[PDB]
Amino acid sequence: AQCEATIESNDAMQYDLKEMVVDKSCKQFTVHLKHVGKMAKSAMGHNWVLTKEADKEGVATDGMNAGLAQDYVKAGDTRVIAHTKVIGGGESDSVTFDVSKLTPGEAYAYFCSFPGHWAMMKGTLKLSN
Ligand SMILES: [Cu+2]
């Protein structure tokens, strides 16, 4: 979508994309998260979080402990490349990140850090041309 992509989250605790590709010509990347469900953020809130695949579970665990006001992301967690807000049904959010944060040919994990969702809601992101 240039240097943008749109991802959908629903009431089934799913994302519609399992992988994202960042083009090499991009200096900035933008992700647009949409919550196409009708459930409340307290019940089935979704976010989109970018980490080294390695940091997935540790960031997820710390995020859970941060609470909803922190969007289920430990504040200033340095393992976090980018993340959106936690949204409810009918909402959306966008995050733009600096691509030079990514290392070519390395796979990254994107997941939802709302409590219990990282196990069902995850995908890979990589830089490719
Ligand atoms: Cu979620």
Swiss-Prot record:
Keywords on record: Copper, Disulfide bond, Electron transport, Metal-binding, Periplasm, Signal, Transport
Binding site for Cu cation: 46, 112, 117, 121
Cellular component annotations (GO), alphabetically ordered: periplasmic space
InterPro entries assigned to the protein according to its UniProt record, in alphabetical order: Azurin, BlueCu_1, BlueCu_1_BS, Cu-binding_ET, Cupredoxin
Compartments in which it is found: Periplasm
Domain Plastocyanin-like, chain residue ranges per copy: 1-129
Single GO term (MF): copper ion binding
Disulfide bonds: 3-26
Main subcellular localisation: periplasm
PANTHER family from the UniProt entry: AURACYANIN-B, OUTER MEMBRANE PROTEIN H.8
Function: Transfers electrons from cytochrome c551 to cytochrome oxidase.
Protein name per Swiss-Prot or TrEMBL: Azurin
Gene behind this protein: azu
